[PDB]
Amino acid sequence: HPEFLKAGKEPGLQIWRVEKFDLVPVPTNLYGDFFTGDAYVILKTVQLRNGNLQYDLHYWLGNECSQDESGAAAIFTVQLDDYLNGRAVQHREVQGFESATFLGYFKSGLKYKKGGVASGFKHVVVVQRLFQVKGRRVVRATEVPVSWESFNNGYCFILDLGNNIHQWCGSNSNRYERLKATQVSKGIRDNERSGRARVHVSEEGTEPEAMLQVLGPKPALPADAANRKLAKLYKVSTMSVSLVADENPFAQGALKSEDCFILDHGKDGKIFVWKGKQANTEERKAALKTASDFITKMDYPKQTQVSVLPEGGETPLFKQFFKNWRDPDQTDGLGLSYLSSHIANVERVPFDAATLHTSTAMAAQHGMDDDGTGQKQIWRIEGSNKVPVDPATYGQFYGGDSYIILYNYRHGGRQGQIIYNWQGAQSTQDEVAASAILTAQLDEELGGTPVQSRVVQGKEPAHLMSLFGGKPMIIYKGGTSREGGQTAPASTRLFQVRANSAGATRAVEVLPKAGALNSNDAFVLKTPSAAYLWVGTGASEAEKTGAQELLRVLRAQPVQVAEGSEPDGFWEALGGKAAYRTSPRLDKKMDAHPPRLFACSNKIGRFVIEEVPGELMQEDLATDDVMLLDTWDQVFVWVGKDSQEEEKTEALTSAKRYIETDPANRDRRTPITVVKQGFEPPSFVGWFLGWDDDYWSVDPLDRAMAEL
Amino acid sequence: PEFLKAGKEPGLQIWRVEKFDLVPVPTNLYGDFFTGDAYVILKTVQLRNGNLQYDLHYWLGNECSQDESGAAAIFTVQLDDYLNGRAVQHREVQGFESATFLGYFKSGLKYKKGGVASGFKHVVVVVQRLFQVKGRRVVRATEVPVSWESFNNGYCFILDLGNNIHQWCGSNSNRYERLKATQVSKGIRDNERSGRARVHVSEEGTEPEAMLQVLGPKPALPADAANRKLAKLYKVSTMSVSLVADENPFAQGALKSEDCFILDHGKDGKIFVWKGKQANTEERKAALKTASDFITKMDYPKQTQVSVLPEGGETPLFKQFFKNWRDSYLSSHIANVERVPFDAATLHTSTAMAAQHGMDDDGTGQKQIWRIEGSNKVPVDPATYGQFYGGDSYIILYNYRHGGRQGQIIYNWQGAQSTQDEVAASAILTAQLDEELGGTPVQSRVVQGKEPAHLMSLFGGKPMIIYKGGTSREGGQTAPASTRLFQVRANSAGATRAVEVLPKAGALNSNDAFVLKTPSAAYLWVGTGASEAEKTGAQELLRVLRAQPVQVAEGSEPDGFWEALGGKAAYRTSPRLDKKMDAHPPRLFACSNKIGRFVIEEVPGELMQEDLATDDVMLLDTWDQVFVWVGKDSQEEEKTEALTSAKRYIETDPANRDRRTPITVVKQGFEPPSFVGWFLGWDDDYWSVDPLDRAMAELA
């Protein structure tokens, strides 16, 4: 097919409109408008860092689409995928409920237009149209009858009169949605009228005569998270299904190459169809029909999103339904199966302490706002008070205590502060609770500006490891460093020793079993007789240096041992034999779990989150929102200055619920880091290309209305 | 009296030969030469161990007397004698001077009209001179008559009026040569007028009145590689010559200490005269006159350069005409380079160590490896990263970190038994992926058995294993040979490579560990010179080979070991060179293929960023690898022939270099550490503002 040979040769986006079983290219300046009476085929081509190309195939159905037009677009999707050697991820998209990654391709917004090929309409490049504009992250302009009846005071509308474009904002429309509706107006101006058209903004009671002349005289106008965590897995075999796993996280083994699978997430709006390598081609080529039959049989809504993945090319959202997804490539290669397109343009900068003060990009990508060298104060929580820790023992933390670390960070030409609230795993509830309140209290003392990070024992963020000079972070199971009473330590104790990109190490005590070992780390097991230093295959320089800087304060003397080839007195101290972690971990962690940005809300007594599609942009931080920025290691909570006071005070709780509902069954101990608008740390800012320190000095909407 | 001041410390001294006397030139005027006179130039480089090394040059102007020229020749022979015959002598002629002579003056040369005979002196006044400035790397400013007729629109000119110095640039003058002519202008300012002068730059049509007052109203103005590879060797015996070897590389044995020899390279502009220790004092002291007679008898241009060397004090340039020269000299453009030994811990801090060891980083970065099957890249099994079959060709995309900076290297490895189509396809696929990644990754073509050090260091602790032929592609696994030999070498970093070789004794080498594999057992031979990593590397190979080693030392090893080899024979026991920098210092050349003919011009003296012209393609020949530097504003076909220009540079080298020598293409502004580290004074923002824009606003 003539357009097939133009398909996906370079990185880019291509949109064809399905016209009487033919693919007709949509003019590029009109990308984002869709005739609701037609169907379209969208090919996103992404370059994969090693130069290869990755394909996301979407077909889109309008509400007034034919069934043969809808069929044509699906047929084209199968055969385009076929022509590109089956490596594409396919997506069925339905007007109004389209996936986030489709939505990422159009961040000027979407325009749903009345008409279709059946009614004689074309993407040509004299007007009188009216659009209802809805949406906060996902902006949609629906064509509506030109009548005051289409209007309501909740939203913004665009009355398009050709050379003049009338954006009208309802009185009860909030000012962020006005800024988004302005994108729509500006688009029509610059893309449909190629700049030579005037945009007139107006509120109610200030409508121009042009607007009242077509619309007449204005009358009076009118004005979730629970469902995410559970999914199930099915094998497909007319077609019928057998249930292979009724609760996630799933076994990656359940996916057999000989068959195809349906991962049902339909109470949350999505099903995946996984195509196995060795499944027969008749079944694979019918992966779209299989899916829609599934949606009908389970009485799911017809808008449900569908993605078909090929084996070896799965997306991160898909794979995170499974416990510990791995491939051979994994450690060797430079990337994984899929590259989430909203981080595809991010240059990866590995850690370099010397230049750390230069690169927010490195701060963000490595969770280090600085080198850890700043002045810091540490307290221990005793009863209802903070007690200064002995500076001699900075770096040691007992699991029966809770601490507060006030730390001053310098990076670039700015100063800021972080309050770390470390909560031991055996600290009593009253003292843990007290540490959380004292953290907030000292946040308010310092003007509400410092970052607050709640971290619990055994999941310490990288930045926290690097505060203690060269000394490692030592984390006892453990007892109490409070002056009242120190326990005699356990008979035999083992310490897992981890490093970070910065080189800093921490030694965290865990129970003395073989099941707690790890190839990637150095361990220190202490027995009555002597002192060991086990050193894994994966272990490196910093991990051993760190492991015997521990051995000095332990008042012990090392007997170094490599993994696998070891004395057996060490395996007596362990009490026997079991398998342990030998697989490496991910610099690829960004690829497996790219950062995602969500808004979230607490009323209707119900927690709701909305993901923001596409590239992380400062513009998506609405000052009347609380946002979640989910780095895999850390969930930042960004609190807008004009969000509700209840929303502000439940910042932590919002994140906790975000994590408790994640279908990935995330770690209950995942650190949460609250940050204030205009006081964001490097680790947060660096995820946003184009961040601007004076972005909020002028109101974003005042800016974009004098700006045009 | 002047002899006793000669060559006591490192430095440079220039005398003017004035009526058979040596008269020192004032130091602020070093670089100026009267065209009617001759000079004697002594470069005193501190050899590298505390001793002193002497390069003696005498220079003849175009209007030099014949008694003046003779005086300077006499002085050259007698200074050498006074300095214990250990100097290298050079005959230099105005306009055709050697590269190392030019190295002493990279502000440029001034040829001035006049000499002793016409009553002129190096005084340090009322002036009105005009200089034509010509030259791209070697810049020479010839004094010319003060007239518009001396002007041409190709070049830059300097009208020196004393307190005012008028540098004039032709319409059709290139802006890099503008940058070089301003060096001359400021040189006059800061050295002849001791700073006390204005330099005024002007182009055609914008000449000041000062300039049109002297010159009148402006009228209309006007506007190799084959020869290097062959040389011959002669014995000298009036004098006549015997031909001792009519084609290089030469036998070093051919130089007998009792005679003198002429190595003829005169089709390339140079002859050497080699003085044997035990040759008689009459023949040695007449080596220059012998040379000139040879030049006359073979009807070479009188401009031909001549160097006479003493045995044991030969030049690297001279010794590379010989096969395996064994057994002084320090190229003075490598003489101030502090040599930094390898320390992986601090590798990221020192460009210098990166350059001197061919290591952009430790090799631990993220990498992807493909094998070429047909016209496509197919990913190699990650289990087998590090193994390369000689029937295949591969592409390695590697991510390197150094300083606080990132870059990329695409290695295109071409097996010795790979089909031409697949090799060609590998070469096209590397260029395509370079373009796909923005044109910035360095591209290094390596041929099997000549892997650069950095490539060995990519595979963890594992060594890079290189099989003779076969293919890791899914189509066909041939059963390997019954008996197999593997040469195991290490690099400065500790990394190892195991290169399969023919199973001969003549293929062994004392410096390395070897692995001979037989049906019965697996050996691990260990040379005298073999060291710690070579054994470590050699026994991880025995692991991959599904075999278990029987270790054996050199010289004293079983007789079952050598039945597998098919007998015994002599092999390589000679050690290798950290001294390689000294035997083969890096050299920088420009090159061009215009007029359908390949031409190179060496850039003299200390390697400096500024000599990287953005409209040139440059070759930096590290002995191990030839970098080719592509300036952003060079012509499109020169860019696309970067690889091929380096290939012909190597095929025409009189050193008879390995055709498998790696070639590494690197782009202006994206140079890797291993390249950058050779230019002390390199600056990451040098090209952020145009060099001539700076050097026109600079000072002015």
The backbone torsions φ and ψ at residue A114, rounded to the nearest 5 degrees and listed phi first, read -75, 140
Phi/psi-derived region of residue B528, left when phi > 0, alpha when psi is between -120 and 50, beta in every other case: alpha
Tokens representing residue A41 in the block: 């085929």
CB-based contact A332 B367, cutoff 8 Å: yes
The backbone torsions φ and ψ at residue B201, rounded to the nearest 5 degrees and listed phi first, read -95, 140
B74, B203: one domain: no
Residue A392, judged by CB atoms within 10 A of its CB (0-12, 13-18, 19+), counts as exposed
- CATH code of residue A571: 3.40.20.10
Closest CA to B356 of B595, B667, B684, B625: B625
Residues 6+ positions from A568 with CB-CB distance below 8 Å? none
A521, A435: one domain: no
- Closest in A328, A330, A334 to B367, CB measured: A334
B310, B424: one domain: no
Tokens 């077609």 -> residue: A239
Q: List chain A residues with CB under 8 Å of B386.
A: none
CB-based contact A332 B385, cutoff 8 Å: yes
Element (H, E) at B593: none
> Among residues A186, A203, A224, which one ends one of the domains?
A224
A556, A516: one domain: yes
Which residues, listed in sequence order, are joined to residue B366 by a DSSP beta bridge?
none
Q: What is the CA radius of gyration of chain A?
A: 29
Q: How far is A16 from chain B (nearest CA, A)?
A: 25
Q: Which of A53, A334, A356, A583 to mutate to test the interface with B (most CBs of B within 10 A)?
A: A334
Asked if residues A390 and A410 have their Cβ atoms less than 8 Å apart, the reply is no
User: CA nearest A330 in B: which residue?
Assistant: B382
Tokens 């150094």 -> residue: B402
- With H, G, I as helix, E, B as strand and everything else as coil, classify residue B43: strand
Q: Which of A326, A329, A332, A586 to mutate to test the interface with B (most CBs of B within 10 A)?
A: A332
Q: List chain B residues with CB under 8 Å of A355.
A: 403-404
Q: How far is A539 from chain B (nearest CA, A)?
A: 13
Report how far residue A261's alpha carbon sits from residue A308's, in angstroms, rounded to the nearest whole number. 10
Amino acid at B579: K
User: CA nearest B397 in A: which residue?
Assistant: A50
Report the number of distinct structural domains present in chain A: 6
Q: How many CB pairs under 8 A join A and B?
A: 39
Q: How far is A543 from chain B (nearest CA, A)?
A: 16
B376, B313: one domain: no
Q: Which chain A residues have any C-beta within 8 angstroms of a chain B C-beta?
A: 47, 50-51, 328-334, 347, 349-350, 352, 354-355, 358, 587
- With H, G, I as helix, E, B as strand and everything else as coil, classify residue A128: coil
Report how far residue A334's alpha carbon sits from residue B399's, in angstroms, rounded to the nearest whole number. 9
- Closest in B382, B436, B437 to A333, CB measured: B382
User: CA nearest A333 in B: which residue?
Assistant: B368
Asked if residues B159 and B112 have their Cβ atoms less than 8 Å apart, the reply is no
CB-based contact B404 A51, cutoff 8 Å: no
Report how far residue B130's alpha carbon sits from residue B148's, in angstroms, rounded to the nearest whole number. 10
Q: Distances in Å between the alpha carbon of A689 and those of A11, A615, A685, B405?
A: 20, 9, 8, 19
A518, A614: one domain: no
Tokens representing residue B464 in the block: 């890079």
A597, A663: one domain: yes
Edge to edge, what strands does the sheet with B198-203 contain?
A: B32-34, B109-112, B140-144, B129-134, B156-160, B164-169, B198-203
- Closest in B404, B406, B433 to A358, CB measured: B404
Q: List chain B residues with CB under 8 Å of A540.
A: none
A344, A466: one domain: yes
CB-based contact A355 B404, cutoff 8 Å: yes
Task: Please report how the helices B66-82 and B287-297 are oriented relative to each other, as an axis angle in degrees rounded to 10.
Answer: 130
> Among residues A527, A561, A584, which one ends one of the domains?
A584
Tokens representing residue B195 in the block: 């700073």
Closest CA to A465 of A499, A420, A424: A499
Report how far residue B485's alpha carbon sits from residue B447's, in angstroms, rounded to the nearest whole number. 19
- With H, G, I as helix, E, B as strand and everything else as coil, classify residue B232: strand
Which own/partner contact pairs does A500-503 have at CB distance under 8 Å and 24+ positions apart?
Answer: A500/A366, A500/A368, A500/A462, A500/A465, A500/A466, A501/A350, A501/A351, A501/A366, A501/A368, A501/A462, A502/A351, A502/A353, A502/A366, A502/A368, A502/A371, A502/A372, A502/A462, A502/A465, A502/A466, A503/A353, A503/A466, A503/A542
The backbone torsions φ and ψ at residue B290, rounded to the nearest 5 degrees and listed phi first, read -50, -50
User: Helical H runs in A89-174?
Assistant: 100-104
Q: Distances in Å between the alpha carbon of A601 and those of A666, B146, B511?
A: 21, 86, 71
User: CA nearest A328 in B: which residue?
Assistant: B382
Q: Which chain B residues have any C-beta within 8 angstroms of a chain A C-beta?
A: 348, 366-368, 379, 381-383, 385, 397, 399, 401, 403-404, 406, 433, 436-437
A472, A482: one domain: yes
Q: Are strands B270-275 and A522-526 parallel, antiparallel or unpaired?
A: unpaired
Report how far residue B91's alpha carbon sits from residue B303's, in angstroms, rounded to the nearest whole number. 9
A565, A600: one domain: no
Q: Which of B367, B368, B387, B395 to mutate to test the interface with A (most CBs of A within 10 A)?
A: B368
Report how far residue B617's alpha carbon sits from residue B635's, in angstroms, rounded to the nearest whole number. 9
Of all residues in chain A, what percent are helix, strand and coil, respectively (each to 5)? 25, 30, 45
A149, A120: one domain: no
Strand runs labelled E in A479-530: 493-499, 505-510, 522-526
Asked if residues A258 and A250 have their Cβ atoms less than 8 Å apart, the reply is no
Question: 3-state secondary structure string, B294-354?
Answer: HHHHCCCCCCCEEEEEECCCCCHHHHCCECCCCCCCCCHHHCCCCCCCCCHHHHHHCHHHH
Edge to edge, what strands does the sheet with A89-94 contain?
A: A23-25, A12-18, A39-47, A53-61, A89-94, A305-310, A270-275, A260-265, A232-236, A241-245
User: CA nearest A336 in B: which residue?
Assistant: B368
Tokens representing residue A296 in the block: 């009908």
- Please name the method used to determine this structure: X-ray
Report how far residue A480's alpha carbon sits from residue A488's, in angstroms, rounded to the nearest whole number. 11
Report how far residue A138's alpha carbon sits from residue A108's, in angstroms, rounded to the nearest whole number. 10
Which residues, listed in sequence order, are joined to residue A142 by a DSSP beta bridge?
A112, A132
Tokens representing residue A315 in the block: 């997306």
Q: Distances in Å between the alpha carbon of A670 and those of A363, A461, A585, A632, B574?
A: 19, 9, 17, 9, 62
Residue B194, judged by CB atoms within 10 A of its CB (0-12, 13-18, 19+), counts as exposed
Neighbour tally for B668: CB within 10 Å: 19
Phi/psi-derived region of residue A150, left when phi > 0, alpha when psi is between -120 and 50, beta in every other case: alpha
Cα A491-A497-A498 angle, rounded to 5 deg? 155
User: CA nearest A350 in B: which residue?
Assistant: B401
Q: Are strands A129-134 and A39-47 parallel, antiparallel or unpaired?
A: unpaired
A456, A541: one domain: no
Cα B445-B446-B449 angle, rounded to 5 deg? 170
Q: Which of A47, A49, A50 to mutate to test the interface with B (most CBs of B within 10 A)?
A: A50
Neighbour tally for A194: CB within 10 Å: 10
Tokens 């760190």 -> residue: A546
User: CA nearest B399 in A: which residue?
Assistant: A334
> Among residues A584, A613, A643, which one ends one of the domains?
A584
Cα B641-B643-B647 angle, rounded to 5 deg? 110
Structural domain boundaries, residue A703 = 585-708
Q: How far is B396 from chain A (nearest CA, A)?
A: 10
Report how far residue B275's alpha carbon sits from residue B263's, in angstroms, rounded to the nearest whole number. 11
Residues 6+ positions from B209 with CB-CB distance below 8 Å? none
Q: How far is A374 from chain B (nearest CA, A)?
A: 22
CB-based contact A328 B381, cutoff 8 Å: yes
Closest CA to A588 of A330, A340, A388: A330
Amino acid at B406: Q
Q: List chain B residues with CB under 8 Å of A354.
A: 404
